[PDB]
Coordinates of C-alpha atoms and ligand atoms in Angstrom, one line a residue:
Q1 CA -60.8 31.7 -4.1
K2 CA -63.5 29.2 -4.5
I3 CA -64.4 25.9 -2.7
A4 CA -66.2 23.1 -4.6
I5 CA -68.1 20.6 -2.4
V6 CA -68.9 17.3 -4.0
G7 CA -71.9 15.7 -2.4
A8 CA -74.7 17.3 -0.5
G9 CA -75.3 14.8 2.2
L10 CA -75.2 15.5 6.0
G11 CA -71.5 16.1 6.0
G12 CA -71.2 18.1 2.8
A13 CA -74.2 20.4 3.6
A14 CA -72.6 20.9 6.9
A15 CA -69.3 21.9 5.6
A16 CA -71.2 24.2 3.0
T17 CA -73.1 25.9 5.8
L18 CA -70.1 26.4 8.2
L19 CA -67.6 27.5 5.5
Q20 CA -70.1 29.9 3.9
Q21 CA -70.8 31.3 7.4
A22 CA -67.1 31.9 7.9
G23 CA -66.8 34.1 4.7
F24 CA -65.8 31.5 2.1
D25 CA -67.1 31.2 -1.5
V26 CA -68.6 27.7 -1.5
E27 CA -70.7 25.9 -4.0
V28 CA -72.1 22.3 -3.7
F29 CA -72.8 19.8 -6.4
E30 CA -75.2 16.8 -5.8
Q31 CA -75.8 13.9 -8.1
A32 CA -79.3 13.2 -7.0
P33 CA -81.7 14.7 -9.6
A34 CA -83.9 16.0 -6.7
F35 CA -83.7 16.3 -3.0
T36 CA -85.4 13.4 -0.9
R37 CA -86.4 13.6 2.7
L38 CA -84.8 10.2 3.5
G39 CA -87.6 8.9 5.7
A40 CA -85.7 7.5 8.5
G41 CA -84.5 8.4 12.0
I42 CA -81.0 9.6 13.1
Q43 CA -79.4 10.1 16.5
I44 CA -77.5 13.3 17.2
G45 CA -75.4 13.4 20.4
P46 CA -74.5 16.6 22.4
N47 CA -71.0 16.8 20.6
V48 CA -72.6 17.4 17.2
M49 CA -75.5 19.6 18.7
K50 CA -72.8 21.9 19.5
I51 CA -71.8 22.1 15.9
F52 CA -75.4 22.7 15.0
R53 CA -75.3 25.6 17.6
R54 CA -72.6 27.3 15.5
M55 CA -74.9 27.1 12.5
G56 CA -77.7 28.6 14.4
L57 CA -79.7 25.2 14.2
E58 CA -79.5 23.7 17.7
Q59 CA -82.4 25.5 19.2
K60 CA -84.5 24.6 16.2
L61 CA -83.4 21.0 16.1
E62 CA -84.3 20.7 19.9
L63 CA -87.9 21.6 18.8
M64 CA -88.4 18.7 16.3
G65 CA -86.6 15.7 17.5
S66 CA -87.3 13.5 20.5
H67 CA -85.2 14.0 23.7
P68 CA -84.9 10.5 25.2
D69 CA -84.3 10.4 29.0
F70 CA -82.3 7.3 28.7
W71 CA -80.5 4.9 26.3
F72 CA -81.6 1.4 27.3
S73 CA -79.7 -1.7 26.1
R74 CA -81.9 -4.7 26.5
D75 CA -81.5 -8.4 25.8
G76 CA -83.5 -9.2 22.7
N77 CA -84.8 -12.5 24.1
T78 CA -85.5 -11.8 27.8
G79 CA -85.9 -8.0 27.7
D80 CA -83.4 -7.7 30.6
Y81 CA -81.7 -4.3 30.8
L82 CA -78.0 -4.5 30.0
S83 CA -77.5 -0.9 30.4
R84 CA -79.4 2.4 31.3
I85 CA -77.3 5.3 29.9
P86 CA -78.6 8.5 31.5
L87 CA -79.4 11.3 29.0
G88 CA -82.2 13.9 29.2
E89 CA -81.5 16.8 31.6
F90 CA -78.3 14.9 32.7
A91 CA -76.9 14.9 29.2
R92 CA -77.6 18.7 28.9
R93 CA -75.9 19.4 32.1
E94 CA -73.1 17.0 31.9
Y95 CA -72.2 17.4 28.1
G96 CA -73.4 21.0 27.5
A97 CA -76.0 20.0 24.9
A98 CA -79.0 17.8 24.4
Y99 CA -79.1 14.2 23.1
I100 CA -81.9 14.1 20.5
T101 CA -83.4 11.6 18.1
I102 CA -84.9 13.2 15.0
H103 CA -86.3 12.6 11.5
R104 CA -83.2 12.4 9.2
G105 CA -85.0 13.8 6.2
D106 CA -86.2 16.8 8.0
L107 CA -82.7 17.4 9.5
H108 CA -81.1 16.9 6.0
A109 CA -83.6 19.5 4.5
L110 CA -83.0 22.0 7.3
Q111 CA -79.3 21.5 6.8
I112 CA -79.3 22.3 3.1
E113 CA -81.7 25.2 3.7
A114 CA -79.0 26.9 5.8
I115 CA -76.7 27.0 2.8
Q116 CA -76.8 30.2 0.8
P117 CA -79.5 29.9 -2.0
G118 CA -78.4 29.4 -5.4
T119 CA -75.2 27.7 -4.4
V120 CA -76.5 24.0 -4.1
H121 CA -76.9 22.3 -7.5
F122 CA -78.6 18.9 -8.0
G123 CA -78.3 16.5 -11.0
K124 CA -74.6 17.2 -10.9
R125 CA -72.8 13.8 -10.9
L126 CA -69.0 14.0 -10.7
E127 CA -67.4 11.8 -13.5
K128 CA -63.8 13.2 -13.6
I129 CA -61.7 15.4 -11.4
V130 CA -58.3 16.6 -12.2
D131 CA -55.9 18.3 -9.9
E132 CA -54.3 20.7 -12.4
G133 CA -51.8 21.9 -9.7
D134 CA -53.0 25.6 -9.1
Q135 CA -56.8 24.7 -9.5
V136 CA -59.0 21.6 -9.9
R137 CA -61.3 20.8 -12.9
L138 CA -64.6 19.1 -12.1
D139 CA -66.3 17.2 -14.9
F140 CA -70.0 16.4 -14.5
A141 CA -72.1 13.7 -16.2
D142 CA -74.5 16.3 -17.7
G143 CA -71.6 17.7 -19.8
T144 CA -71.1 20.9 -17.7
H145 CA -68.0 21.5 -15.6
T146 CA -66.6 23.8 -13.1
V147 CA -63.2 24.8 -11.5
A148 CA -62.4 25.7 -7.9
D149 CA -59.2 26.2 -5.8
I150 CA -59.9 23.2 -3.5
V151 CA -62.4 20.4 -3.6
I152 CA -64.1 18.8 -0.7
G153 CA -64.8 15.2 -1.0
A154 CA -68.3 14.4 0.5
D155 CA -69.4 11.9 -1.9
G156 CA -70.0 9.2 0.8
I157 CA -69.1 5.5 0.7
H158 CA -68.9 5.4 -3.2
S159 CA -66.9 8.5 -3.4
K160 CA -65.7 9.4 -6.8
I161 CA -63.1 11.6 -5.3
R162 CA -61.5 8.7 -3.4
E163 CA -61.7 6.8 -6.6
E164 CA -59.9 9.2 -8.8
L165 CA -57.3 9.5 -6.0
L166 CA -56.7 5.9 -5.1
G167 CA -58.1 3.8 -7.9
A168 CA -61.2 1.6 -8.4
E169 CA -60.8 0.0 -4.9
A170 CA -61.2 -3.8 -4.4
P171 CA -64.8 -5.1 -4.3
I172 CA -66.5 -5.5 -0.8
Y173 CA -69.1 -8.1 -0.3
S174 CA -72.2 -7.3 1.6
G175 CA -72.8 -10.1 4.3
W176 CA -74.9 -8.1 6.6
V177 CA -78.2 -6.1 6.1
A178 CA -80.1 -3.3 7.9
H179 CA -84.0 -3.4 8.0
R180 CA -85.6 0.1 8.4
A181 CA -89.1 1.2 9.0
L182 CA -91.2 4.1 10.3
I183 CA -94.2 3.3 12.4
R184 CA -97.3 5.5 12.7
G185 CA -100.9 4.8 13.4
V186 CA -103.0 3.3 16.2
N187 CA -100.5 0.4 16.2
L188 CA -98.2 2.9 17.9
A189 CA -100.9 4.3 20.2
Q190 CA -102.1 0.8 21.2
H191 CA -98.5 -0.2 22.5
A192 CA -97.2 3.2 23.4
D193 CA -96.7 2.2 27.2
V194 CA -94.1 -0.4 26.2
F195 CA -92.3 1.7 23.4
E196 CA -89.3 3.3 25.0
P197 CA -88.0 6.6 23.6
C198 CA -84.5 5.1 22.9
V199 CA -83.6 1.5 23.2
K200 CA -81.4 -0.9 21.5
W201 CA -82.4 -4.7 21.5
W202 CA -79.3 -6.9 21.5
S203 CA -79.0 -10.7 20.7
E204 CA -76.2 -13.1 19.8
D205 CA -75.6 -12.1 16.2
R206 CA -78.2 -9.4 15.4
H207 CA -79.7 -6.3 16.9
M208 CA -82.6 -3.7 16.6
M209 CA -82.3 0.0 17.5
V210 CA -85.6 1.8 18.1
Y211 CA -86.3 5.4 18.9
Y212 CA -88.9 8.1 18.2
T213 CA -88.3 10.8 15.5
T214 CA -90.2 13.9 16.8
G215 CA -91.0 15.4 20.2
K216 CA -94.6 14.5 19.7
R217 CA -93.8 10.8 19.8
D218 CA -96.2 10.2 16.9
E219 CA -93.6 8.4 14.8
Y220 CA -91.4 5.3 15.8
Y221 CA -88.4 4.2 13.8
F222 CA -86.3 1.1 14.1
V223 CA -83.1 0.0 12.3
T224 CA -81.7 -3.5 12.4
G225 CA -78.3 -5.3 11.8
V226 CA -79.0 -8.9 10.5
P227 CA -76.8 -11.5 8.8
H228 CA -77.7 -11.8 5.2
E229 CA -76.8 -13.5 2.0
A230 CA -74.6 -11.6 -0.6
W231 CA -76.3 -8.4 -1.7
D232 CA -76.5 -8.6 -5.5
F233 CA -79.5 -6.2 -6.3
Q234 CA -79.6 -3.5 -8.8
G235 CA -80.5 -0.9 -6.0
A236 CA -79.2 0.1 -2.6
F237 CA -82.5 -0.9 -1.0
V238 CA -85.2 -3.5 -1.5
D239 CA -88.6 -3.8 0.1
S240 CA -88.6 -6.2 3.0
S241 CA -91.7 -7.9 4.6
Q242 CA -93.2 -8.8 8.0
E243 CA -92.6 -12.4 7.2
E244 CA -88.8 -11.7 6.7
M245 CA -88.6 -9.8 10.0
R246 CA -90.5 -12.4 12.0
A247 CA -88.1 -15.1 10.9
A248 CA -85.1 -12.8 11.4
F249 CA -86.2 -11.8 14.9
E250 CA -87.7 -15.1 16.1
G251 CA -87.5 -15.5 19.8
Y252 CA -87.3 -11.7 20.6
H253 CA -89.3 -10.0 23.3
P254 CA -93.0 -9.4 22.6
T255 CA -92.3 -5.6 22.3
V256 CA -90.0 -6.3 19.4
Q257 CA -92.7 -8.6 18.0
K258 CA -95.3 -6.0 18.4
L259 CA -93.0 -3.5 16.5
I260 CA -92.9 -5.8 13.4
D261 CA -96.6 -6.2 13.4
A262 CA -97.1 -2.4 13.5
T263 CA -95.2 -1.8 10.3
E264 CA -96.6 -1.1 6.9
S265 CA -93.6 -0.7 4.5
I266 CA -90.1 -2.1 5.4
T267 CA -87.0 -1.5 3.4
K268 CA -83.7 -3.5 3.5
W269 CA -80.3 -2.0 3.1
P270 CA -77.0 -3.9 2.6
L271 CA -74.0 -3.2 4.9
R272 CA -70.4 -3.6 3.9
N273 CA -68.2 -6.4 5.5
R274 CA -65.1 -4.2 5.5
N275 CA -64.0 -0.6 4.8
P276 CA -60.7 0.8 3.6
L277 CA -58.3 2.9 5.7
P278 CA -58.9 6.6 6.1
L279 CA -57.8 9.0 3.2
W280 CA -57.8 12.6 4.4
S281 CA -56.4 14.6 1.6
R282 CA -54.1 14.8 -1.4
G283 CA -53.1 17.9 -3.1
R284 CA -56.1 20.2 -3.4
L285 CA -58.6 17.5 -2.7
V286 CA -59.8 16.9 1.0
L287 CA -62.2 14.3 2.1
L288 CA -64.8 14.0 5.0
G289 CA -67.3 11.5 6.3
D290 CA -67.8 8.2 4.6
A291 CA -65.7 9.3 1.8
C292 CA -62.8 9.8 4.2
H293 CA -63.1 7.1 6.8
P294 CA -65.9 4.6 6.0
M295 CA -66.9 2.4 9.1
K296 CA -69.3 -0.1 10.2
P297 CA -72.5 1.7 11.4
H298 CA -72.4 -0.2 14.8
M299 CA -71.9 2.9 16.8
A300 CA -74.5 5.3 15.2
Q301 CA -71.8 7.8 14.9
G302 CA -71.0 8.0 11.1
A303 CA -72.9 11.1 10.3
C304 CA -71.9 12.8 13.4
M305 CA -68.3 12.2 12.3
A306 CA -69.1 13.6 9.0
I307 CA -70.4 16.8 10.6
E308 CA -67.3 16.9 13.0
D309 CA -65.0 16.7 10.1
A310 CA -66.8 19.5 8.4
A311 CA -66.5 21.6 11.6
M312 CA -62.8 20.8 12.1
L313 CA -62.0 21.3 8.5
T314 CA -63.6 24.8 8.6
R315 CA -61.5 25.7 11.7
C316 CA -58.3 24.7 9.9
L317 CA -59.2 26.6 6.7
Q318 CA -60.1 29.7 8.9
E319 CA -56.6 29.5 10.4
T320 CA -54.6 29.2 7.1
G321 CA -56.9 30.4 4.2
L322 CA -57.4 28.9 0.8
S323 CA -53.9 30.1 -0.2
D324 CA -52.3 27.7 2.3
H325 CA -54.5 24.6 1.7
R326 CA -51.8 22.1 2.3
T327 CA -51.3 23.3 6.0
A328 CA -55.1 23.3 6.4
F329 CA -55.4 19.8 5.2
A330 CA -52.5 18.7 7.3
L331 CA -53.9 20.4 10.4
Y332 CA -57.3 18.8 9.7
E333 CA -56.2 15.2 9.7
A334 CA -53.9 15.8 12.6
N335 CA -56.8 17.1 14.7
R336 CA -59.3 14.4 13.6
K337 CA -57.4 11.0 13.1
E338 CA -57.2 10.1 16.7
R339 CA -60.9 10.7 17.3
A340 CA -61.8 8.8 14.2
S341 CA -59.5 5.9 15.1
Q342 CA -61.2 5.6 18.6
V343 CA -64.6 5.4 17.0
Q344 CA -63.2 2.8 14.5
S345 CA -62.0 0.5 17.3
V346 CA -65.2 0.8 19.3
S347 CA -67.3 -0.3 16.3
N348 CA -64.8 -3.0 15.8
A349 CA -65.5 -4.4 19.3
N350 CA -69.3 -3.8 18.6
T351 CA -69.8 -3.0 22.3
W352 CA -70.9 0.6 22.2
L353 CA -73.5 0.9 25.3
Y354 CA -73.9 -2.8 25.6
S355 CA -73.0 -2.6 29.3
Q356 CA -72.9 0.4 31.7
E357 CA -70.1 2.6 30.4
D358 CA -69.2 6.2 30.5
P359 CA -70.0 7.9 27.1
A360 CA -68.4 11.2 28.0
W361 CA -65.6 10.8 25.6
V362 CA -68.1 10.8 22.8
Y363 CA -70.9 13.3 23.9
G364 CA -68.7 15.7 26.1
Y365 CA -66.2 16.3 23.2
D366 CA -65.5 20.0 22.6
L367 CA -64.5 20.3 18.9
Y368 CA -64.2 24.0 19.3
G369 CA -62.2 23.9 22.4
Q370 CA -59.4 21.8 20.9
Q371 CA -56.1 23.5 20.2
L372 CA -55.2 23.0 16.4
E373 CA -51.5 23.5 17.0
Ligands
LIG1 C1 -77.8 1.5 9.3 C2 -77.1 2.8 9.6 C3 -77.5 3.6 10.7 C4 -76.8 4.7 11.1 N1 -77.1 5.5 12.1 C5 -76.6 6.6 12.3 C6 -76.9 7.4 13.4 O1 -77.8 7.1 14.3 N2 -76.2 8.5 13.7 C7 -75.2 8.9 12.9 O2 -74.6 10.0 13.1 N3 -74.8 8.2 11.7 C8 -75.4 7.2 11.5 N4 -75.1 6.4 10.5 C9 -74.0 7.0 9.6 C10 -74.5 7.8 8.5 O3 -75.7 7.3 7.8 C11 -73.4 8.1 7.5 O4 -72.1 8.1 8.2 C12 -73.5 9.5 6.9 O5 -74.6 9.5 5.9 C13 -72.2 10.0 6.1 O6 -72.4 11.2 5.6 P1 -71.6 11.7 4.3 O7 -72.0 13.2 3.9 O8 -70.1 11.5 4.5 O9 -72.1 10.7 3.2 P2 -73.5 10.5 2.7 O10 -74.5 10.9 3.8 O11 -73.7 9.2 2.0 O12 -73.7 11.7 1.6 C14 -73.0 11.6 0.4 C15 -73.7 12.5 -0.6 O13 -72.9 12.6 -1.8 C16 -73.6 12.3 -2.9 N5 -72.7 11.8 -4.0 C17 -72.2 10.6 -4.0 N6 -71.3 10.4 -5.1 C18 -71.5 11.7 -5.8 C19 -70.9 12.1 -7.0 N7 -70.1 11.4 -7.8 N8 -71.2 13.4 -7.4 C20 -72.0 14.1 -6.6 N9 -72.7 13.8 -5.4 C21 -72.3 12.5 -5.1 C22 -74.6 11.3 -2.5 O14 -75.9 11.3 -3.5 C23 -75.1 11.8 -1.1 O15 -76.1 12.8 -1.2 C24 -75.8 5.2 10.1 C25 -75.4 4.4 9.0 C26 -76.1 3.2 8.7 C27 -75.7 2.5 7.4

């Protein structure tokens, strides 16, 4: 009884670690020819820190990442504080875990290192997947192939598993864009007094989220959401420039302007205008994360949902075993579709932490306390 996970992202590697720790025989196949530390920040709330606790990674992750005392929502133009969401020691006491902001590449690397060695394969690009009935044949672009009893679809937004299941999918134009940059140097130390640990700068049609990536506060990361022309480039990221960011964020608070001046290299990433409806499973194939329920990143919860899917899916396979995968896949959708729908409608309103609201329904969620029924 073997599980084949397609895709070694944050979601797939989390499923690999959790399912292997539960006793299952899991192998992962990643299309990237090598592993890359992404070189960006990521936010990890207490609800997912509890999943990292089950992997034995929470204590370690608390050592690298930055622990912001507050989430500040600030008006981009005036700098007025729209919300001051208490985290820090309050988050630990009220939600049972810490709210951390951390280097995504170092988290991604530590996650894959938690998988049993010799079971993660790079350069394995899935081209064809055939549900033979009793088993599934996976065909890779390098000519090699494998077989497993179930396949986990963790191939992200451009999931080949969703494609072979539902078809080519209609084209989605990219009308928005996301600038990203890591800031180190004396440019950070010169303005460190005005650089807050975790703050989102809002305006009328754009935003900039900024936070530190380590506990040492020696690295500062921002990620934006700006209207943009239709993305028709050969790559998933193009090099931006200070002139582009200055024009995009004209009128913003001097702190935001200082941030743009402090950069050395800025990359630009396209964002989809729309996403398809969730597809949880069909036959022996089961999906998680962006492959299952692609969403707008307005809530900074996508990867957290991918790991939550991995945790809930493991709880369901532990209850039924691979011999009864259909019941496991049904129990996994039934125990996740309401939470995923709630996150979907909040990113739809694009209002997450704009004003002073109670984030307990996200951070205080107990994935392991839920009854599967
Ligand atoms: C601007 C922005 C900011 C975000 N901020 C946050 C945040 O603060 N917090 C948060 O929790 N989430 C955040 N997210 C969401 C997060 O980036 C994604 O939701 C998350 O990466 C989804 O994980 P995944 O494993 O499902 O897919 P991915 O992370 O995309 O991983 C998929 C993997 O599968 C591989 N793959 C793809 N196709 C194949 C194939 N055919 N064969 C083999 N391998 C394949 C890919 O190479 C990749 O390694 C943000 C997203 C954006 C766009």
